[PDB]
Each structure stands twice: as C-alpha cells, then as structure tokens.
Symmetry: none
Subunit: 191 residues, 2 copies
Amino acid sequence: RPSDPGVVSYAVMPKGSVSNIVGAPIRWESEFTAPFQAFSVDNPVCNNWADIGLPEVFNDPDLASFGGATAQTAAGDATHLVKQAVGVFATVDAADRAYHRVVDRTVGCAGQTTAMHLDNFHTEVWTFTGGPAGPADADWVKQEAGTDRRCFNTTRKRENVLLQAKVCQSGNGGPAVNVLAGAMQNTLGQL
Amino acid sequence: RPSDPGVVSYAVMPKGSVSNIVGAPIRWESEFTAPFQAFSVDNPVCNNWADIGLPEVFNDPDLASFGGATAQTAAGDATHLVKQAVGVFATVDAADRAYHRVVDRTVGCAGQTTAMHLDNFHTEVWTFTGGPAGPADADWVKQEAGTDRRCFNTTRKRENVLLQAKVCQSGNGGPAVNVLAGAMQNTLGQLEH
Ligand SMILES: [Mg+2]
C-alpha cells in the first residue's frame, strides 16, 4: 500500500543508527525538510548523480512530504559522511516521474570527470561511475580526484516514495549504503 | 450515532499530532473556541472557500459546541500551515444546513482568481479549483498567485458534526489533509453500536 506523508519523520535514520550502520563514530548531524542543491556542476548530465535530495528531482506539484539528514564524524570532520533524502508523493506515478528525473537525466554521466562548484566557493573534481539504472533501483559512485574518497549512492522507488542514501569514505561505503537504504525502506509501512 | 458536544475538546489535533501527519516540524499553534473571519474577498462566491471555521457557516441557533486550531512550522514561519474547525450541532439536519452554507454559496468559485484583504492589512491573490461537492464531503484547493503554495481543504458532514481541515504548503497537502480529517473523525464517537 502507499505511504502516508508522515513516514518521512521516521524513515530518516538518526546519527546513532548511522554510526551503527557504517561502523564508525558519527557525532554530528543536520536535518533538512526541503530539497536543496548547494552546488553547480560543469557537465550537466552529472547534476542528478552529484548529490541526493535535489530540487529538480523531488520538487513537484505532487510532492506531499520530504525529509533528509547529513551526518558526519564530527562538526568540521566529514571523514565519514552519510546523507539521506525521503520524498512521499501523492501518487505512485509522481514517484515514478521523480525516479526518472534521476535516471533519465544522468545517461552519459558514467565515465565522466567534472568540477562541482560548491555554493561556499570551494571547487571539487569528481569522477562518476555506474551501471544502467533498474526500473525502481539505481546505484552509482563518485570518486574525488587524487583521493581514495568515494561516495556510494543508491536511489529506491517504492510505491509513492522516492528515497536516496549516500555514504562517503575511503575504502568502500557500498555495503553501508545498502544496509542504510534497507533500514529506511523498512519504515515505509507499505508491507 | 450523533456526537455529544464534548467531542470538540479532543477532536482538534494538537501541533505534535499535526507534525506526525504532515511529516514536518510544527512548533507553533493557536487554539480558538469561536468561528471567526479575518479577511474579505473581492469575489463573494469564494468567501466560504477562502478559509475554514467561518461564522456564516458555523454560527447557528443549533450550534452546540465549536473548537479549532491554526498550527505552523514556527511563530513567524508558515512554510507548513494547518487549520482545523469542528462544530457539533444539536441535530443532524442543522449540521446538513451548515454543510450547505459551505457548498451552496461557493458554486462559481472554481476557476476564479480573487484578492483576499487580511485584517493585518496585507493583500493575497488566490486561484480556486475544486470539483462539485458530494452529499457530505466537499474538497477544494487555493493556490497563491505567482507561487507553488497550495492549500488543500476538506469539509465533511458526519451525523451532527461539520468538520473542516486545511493543509497549506508547496507540493501537495492533499494526502495530509485526508489523514488529518480521518484523525479528527476518529475522535467523534459516532460508530453506531
Ligand atoms: Mg441515528
């Protein structure tokens, strides 16, 4: 069955739960209640892979509710960084259109390196990889140029819900992002 | 079964419950115990769609009890705004007449844009949409001109009760206003046996 808009208050895992999933201290988080994009990317095809919880993906006449969080090792320390975004749509079709704004608009991003101009006047360079998106599930990775830092991303469309999770770290945040997306999905009350 | 007048004391969802329903912080609320109208509209057929809990709808010889609340994100922040009004009438027919003061007097409002003059001296321009009212359920939407802000409204007649709920936000407050109206109805003690 479809989710009520209230599920966003429950579907975002708090920093304690995030710490238990990544296997590292997570002492800082910031919650958000609206989609936001805090950067511009040079290559437009990579916009909807460059972060999650984006306005062009989620903002829609049929967006009923939205919540997310960014969690980190500590204030000023993103050694581990974890982000979550959950949108509840009025219809299953609207959630499908939001899913397709992620996966249709990023065809050609895989294999590209591009500059992210952050709104705080920092510039980062990221290399994107990812296989073809599924009907309701899309994974991709970005790696920061000259580092072993990779962000593992997953997007999940479940009935009238679109959710996204991102785990950034050295090594492989993929296992953690899959455990986290599972934990988020388990709250949706869709049976 | 009709509701006793006392149900208005617990039919209005507090800000904590409203927050759980809309899925966003709701830190501010103001309760009221009398119908009020804090505006005028240029086009009179849109009066009873322009807000809920109105005197011309609820005030009546057979109004037994009345309560409502307005709730917001925070004191000066209406990013989410939610309003509720519950009237208990002495008779089911009096509740039906109150329902018809909403739905009869707003025929022609759908498709109209009109100015709302607020008591605080501000002017807002709203575009009204809505299908024909049902026998006991009337829904409509108003959109603020030049914005994605929409207020989803539901008016429901249940035995001797008229209830109204309004959820204002960007995107679609429709699912939340339906959950909220359901939560309000669940307190009315109307299950027949
Ligand atoms: Mg009876």
